[PDB]
Design an enzyme around this catalytic site. Structure first.
Site, PDB file in Angstrom:
ATOM      1  N   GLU A 107       0.802  -1.347  -0.284  1.00 30.42           N
ATOM      2  CA  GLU A 107      -0.124   0.097  -0.362  1.00 30.42           C
ATOM      3  C   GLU A 107       0.509   1.327   0.068  1.00 30.42           C
ATOM      4  OE1 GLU A 107      -1.849  -0.479   3.361  1.00 30.42           O
ATOM      5  OE2 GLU A 107      -2.669  -2.622   2.843  1.00 30.42           O
ATOM      6  N   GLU A 216      -5.330 -11.018   0.159  1.00 28.70           N
ATOM      7  CA  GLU A 216      -6.104 -10.364   0.824  1.00 28.70           C
ATOM      8  C   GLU A 216      -7.648 -10.896   0.861  1.00 28.70           C
ATOM      9  OE1 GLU A 216      -3.147  -7.062   3.066  1.00 28.70           O
ATOM     10  OE2 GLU A 216      -4.906  -7.262   3.331  1.00 28.70           O
TER      11      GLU A 216
END
Length: 301
Positions: A107, A216
């Protein structure tokens, strides 16, 4: 039989587990039963030890993420990078026996479309810029020449951020950064990305990396009823539709938690193929039995 089995030729079918799941005998038997890949969920590294050992003695592939002070003191880029390499090479050495893949950087891209700079202005970035990613992969490639090394991000299917992920991973690979793979976090919802939106993300990532994991996987409901179990089941089917389409580049599909009881989304978000009692869901059947969705993708608010 097991999800790991059904897809034993598309990709590892993986779960993110915390210490409780591999501690609780019954949750552990399910993990053993359903998955050939474990991400250490926990997003003094005793936890990483247990999850690693669980994978060790049970021969489950471990997705390194769990572990990978250090900027509170505003280090200099130089000192920050030695702290990186230290941590990175420490984390990586201890588990290079079990870890096959690393989320080296997570991220780094911002979610702001209205942002001149496409990187998340994280502390790490404000010190170093692009090159902390470069360094992170260089450090990690070095420490384990081997572990596929994944740039891992979320909303990897929305048009802007994805382009940024691609472009950032393109130029870094273009500049020789050992970004072996792209990890699509897969924090989807029942309105989710459309199949073509995931199709258009994977097909784009395809063109710069030989590896995409889904690191995820999560399908939160509403951005339990009959409407809800079908929407959840349907978008899962939709997602697994597009994932089993790109089985080549996709080596692993990891659900973000063992069940809604464990889910970061909260059980009221009904997000994973196991309800809070770890009974498989109609979503589970839909994925196992590679079903197609009932309804079309719901409309959003």
């Amino acid at each position: 039989q097991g999800l790991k089995d059904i897809y034993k030729d598309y990709f590892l079918i993986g779960v993110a587990v915390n210490q409780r799941n591999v501690s609780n005998a019954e949750q552990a038997a399910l993990v053993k039963q359903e998955f050939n890949s474990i991400t250490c969920e926990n997003d003094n590294w005793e936890a990483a030890d247990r999850i690693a050992n669980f994978c060790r003695t049970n021969g489950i592939k471990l997705r390194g993420h769990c572990l990978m002070w250090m900027y509170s003191d505003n280090p200099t880029k130089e000192v920050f990078f030695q702290r990186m390499k230290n941590h990175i090479q420490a984390v990586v050495s201890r588990y290079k026996d079990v870890v096959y893949a690393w989320d080296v950087v997570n991220e780094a891209m911002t979610d702001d479309p209205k942002a001149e700079d496409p990187f998340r202005q994280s502390p790490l970035y404000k010190i170093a810029g692009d090159e902390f990613i470069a360094k992170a992969f260089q450090y990690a490639r070095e420490a384990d020449p081997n572990a596929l090394l994944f740039y891992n991000d979320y909303n990897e299917c929305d048009p802007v951020k994805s382009q940024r992920i691609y472009e950032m991973v393109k130029r870094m690979k273009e500049n020789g950064v050992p970004i072996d793979g792209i990890g699509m976090q897969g924090h989807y919802n029942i309105y989710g990305p459309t199949e073509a939106e995931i199709d258009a993300a994977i097909t784009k990532y395809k063109s710069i990396v030989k590896h995409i994991h889904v690191t995820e996987l999560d399908i939160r409901v509403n951005a339990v009823s009959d409407s809800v179990k079908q929407h959840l089941a349907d978008q899962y089917a939709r997602v697994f539709n597009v994932l089993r389409k790109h089985r080549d580049v996709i080596d692993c599909v990891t659900f973000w938690n063992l069940s809604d009881r464990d889910s970061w989304l909260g059980q009221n978000n009904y997000p994973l193929p196991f309800d809070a009692n770890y009974k498989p869901k109609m979503a589970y059947d839909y994925i196992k039995q590679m079903k197609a969705p009932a309804w079309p993708i719901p409309e959003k608010p």
